[model samples]
Target chain A: MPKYAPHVYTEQAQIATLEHWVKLLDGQERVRIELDDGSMIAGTVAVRPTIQTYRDEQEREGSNGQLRIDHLDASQEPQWIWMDRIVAVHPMP
Target chain B: MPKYAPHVYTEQAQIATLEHWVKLLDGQERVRIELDDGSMIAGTVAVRPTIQTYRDEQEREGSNGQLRIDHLDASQEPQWIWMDRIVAVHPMP
Candidate 1:
């Protein structure tokens, strides 16, 4: 009866909040992203913008999007890819 | 002659801030401690308090202290030790 289920809306809201935080990091000092596994990956954030959206053929039906980031380490080169999992971001001192 | 150095006091202040944050977690929901290596060790923090103090016997003297944390996993048993290094703590939702 509803155009979109409540859970889908919830996911969208969470994604929006994530995007908002990413925008706040723009042109500012770098922050640390604390991964769930207790490991931290630090870089001057290059980008965290929505790149794509699609439903997975295997999962048979869920909406998802991509968020990309460029690492600051010069030796590592600029890395970019879809973020399937993200833990959390914490601003650095 | 000065009995104390400024940097020593600064370190003390930082340690106090860390202690205060740790106390905030008392009797609350479990939080995550994010390590620098991008690996997570999940546990309900048992303790984080100053346990020892001494001037280094080799470096011609600087004050230092230790903080300890107890991991929550039952299979891991109750482990306790001094903390020589720490990263950051993030409250979980």
Candidate 2:
């Protein structure tokens, strides 16, 4: 089973502390989050990173605030990447 | 003479808006600025990237604030990197 850990559950979560990244994420039209695993995600950080598309912002709990990236290729689904796996976030010009 | 263009005077200066870089610079004991020229500088970002070893923060003007790097090698003099020339700023662990 593909299990997910909340942001507060791990070490990298401390590193994923948002804003510097949030601003970087929103500062430009597009951004990329490079993972410790050497993978990168490109998309727009939902203005409300706290609200998932399917769930009510007020209803969700303990998921450790996802670093949501709405994939640019609409054909692909939006991704709720484990904030802990992200090593770097770069604003895509 | 090696003349300089103050931060407000150039295009990239708009990008060097510190802190995000500063935090990355300070988040660890060391940091590096990768230049548009493809060069990377590693060092401790001067606590007051504004206060220099020689110049007083109160005395300097325009010059668009430098992203100073106190080089790691004791043998090499610290460097005052142009924030604008920095293409990316990454925290070093």
lDDT of 1 by residue, B1-93 (tens): 223221222243334443444443454346655555665454565654452334343323333334334454534665332232335556762
Measured by TM-score, the strongest candidate is 2
In candidate 1, the residue pairs with backbone N, CA or C atoms under 3 Å apart (3 or more residues apart, or in different chains) clash, namely A37-B39, A37-B40, A38-B39, A38-B40, A39-B38, A39-B39, A40-B38
Residue-wise lDDT of candidate 2 within B1-93, one digit each (tens)? 333444332222232344334445555466667888899788776644441122223443243446556777867567877554655666676
Name the lDDT value of residue B10 in candidate 2. Answer: 23
lDDT against the true structure, per candidate, is: 0.45, 0.52
Runs in model 1 lying further than 4 Å from the true structure: A1-13, A59-63, A81-84, B1-93
Residue pairs in collision within model 2: B7-B64
**TM-score, B chain, candidate 2?**
0.57
- TM-score for every candidate vs. truth? 0.34, 0.37
